[PDB]
Structure 1
């Protein structure tokens, strides 16, 4: 089976993000290295995770940093299991983390990217936006959307996230529920990402991310972009994780379903995110023959159990993962009087 890393984006946050997983050394130790990049800017991600409150789930600069810094740590645990990806797909702000997993992005360049991507947006005081996942074909959207309400995310073959004017959402959903349409709102801290709203920011962001990303590294064919049409994958822009790319990702539509297309048929898809947002979408928009696995469940009593639960599932899937890489090495030789094994290896006799 191939392994496919999927990196869920915005709306995927919640008070208490991987406070349980802080225990695990491989995790914490990576979240600390994220502080090391965020220190010259006077910011500590580990505090953002633990002084967490409503306002910081809504603060867009805390979020881009929180999500990315966690995703980057989840990815690290996955690499301790000894599980590298066959395919990679990002979904919005996730792509950043992806470019880490493909190895075009340093943990630092990755973290600081998210940080600025989020900063420049906040400081543009952009007008009250708001997104929602709504269940209609991408073309059904272009037909039935109030003016000024873009279709922004192509998730499934019949699930799309429209982006736009905060007040024009509220009264265009009061209006959709009343016809039984899939509608779950995404928490965006008020900003319409992946719409025309973003062009205003593009200049100042591009001009600044150019100082974080010198120099840009080549992307590998292992990583399918969802920010650039499959058409122009052999292009100049598409070829490298450059500032120019990071900025484009924030401005253009996320072509998710498009990438899901390329996902093989006995594939195992892991959602790498502080919360399994795209579970609905992936299961809907992919073969029944593919197993889909969360890594953390929001508001769970103890993510550390829920992650091991799923590390376990990644095994039942058939993938090659080994938990001993999460916890400190064992001191071989084993103690004397440590339970026999052969008598418990039962066969099909």
Structure 2
């Protein structure tokens, strides 16, 4: 009924939602990942401060901007490494649970304002068709129902401007959406979503990326209430 994601998590959230062709989505993601590797590395990092937007912004130092609004009680910060170290020392002095994440590239900050023309050149005219499944956008916080509009400009803007995940999730909850199926190799968006709605199922986990975890996630989705076609996994046999 909809597919949601965060930044890079919005790539295939636009691919299988009827808003991207497979080949051009592959082109987009290859260019994005190579651009991230080439330039953004060694220019910052993410630190999760286990507080909401107001609490973290009351303590935000210069040079660091809120990475995204992930929830009224969970907001990550991103900025220059020295300011991150100072803010983390201050937070530890305050005793608030704060956790770095080993990211060498500062994402969705001022650093993105330098290679914008590169993304514009590389992502010009990508076949991002009109979504047969309408994804409520997060850059502008409204449903997009046009064909060919979603070019590399909004992709760069998602890569640059702060993502309003909390507002988008609240709007989706208020518009009747309840089931949030988190699909990745390890849960990252489950915690915030679950603290907001209490219904979140992750697909894979660390060290358990085999078939068994896939069937477990499918079973969780099936027991949640949605119907799944189990006949594909198991073929026919004799009478028992």
In the alignment, structure 1 residue 123 sits paired with structure 2 residue 42: no
Query: Is residue 50–residue 98 contact of structure 2 (8 Å, CA) maintained in 1?
Result: yes
Residue aligning to 1:247: 156
| Residue 221 of structure 1: how far off its partner (Å) | 6.5
Structure 1 partner of 2:206: 298
Q: Give a deviation string over 1:57-95, Cα, whole Å, max 9, x none.
A: xxxxxxxxxxxxxxxxxxxxxxxxxxxxx1221111111
2:19 aligns to what SS in structure 1? coil
Which residue pairs with 1:52 in the alignment?
A: none
> Are 1:324 and 2:235 counterparts?
no
Aligned match of 1:311:
218
Structure 2 residue runs of 5 or longer lacking an equivalent are: none
TM-score, normalised on structure 1?
A: 0.62
Contact 1:219 1:239 in 2 (8 A): no
How far off its partner does 1:322 sit? 2.3
Structure 1 pair 203–126 and aligned structure 2 pair: CA distance change class (3 A): farther
Q: Aligned equivalents of 2:37 and 2:28: distance in 1?
A: 14
Matched, 1:193 2:107: yes
Q: Distance in 2 between matches of 1:203 and 1:271?
A: 32
SS at match of 2:62: coil
Tell me which residue corresponds to 2:89: 174
Does the 8 A contact of 1:126 with 1:197 survive in 2?
no
Q: Which residue of 1 aligns with 2:6?
A: 91
Distance verdict in 2 for CA 1:259–1:148, change over 3 Å:
same
Unaligned runs of 5+ in 1: 1-85, 340-349
Aligned to 1:72: none
**What is the distance in 2 between the residues matched to 1:156 and 1:182?**
16
Q: What are the residue-to-residue correspondences of 1:48-197 with 2, within 5 Å?
A: 86-124=1-39, 128-188=43-103, 190-197=104-111
What is the count of residue pairs matched by the alignment? Answer: 238
> Displacement, 1:246?
1.5
Larger Rg: 1
Q: Is the 8 A contact 1:152 1:160 kept in 2?
A: yes
Higher relative contact order (CA 8 A, sep 6+): 1
TM-score (norm 2): 0.88
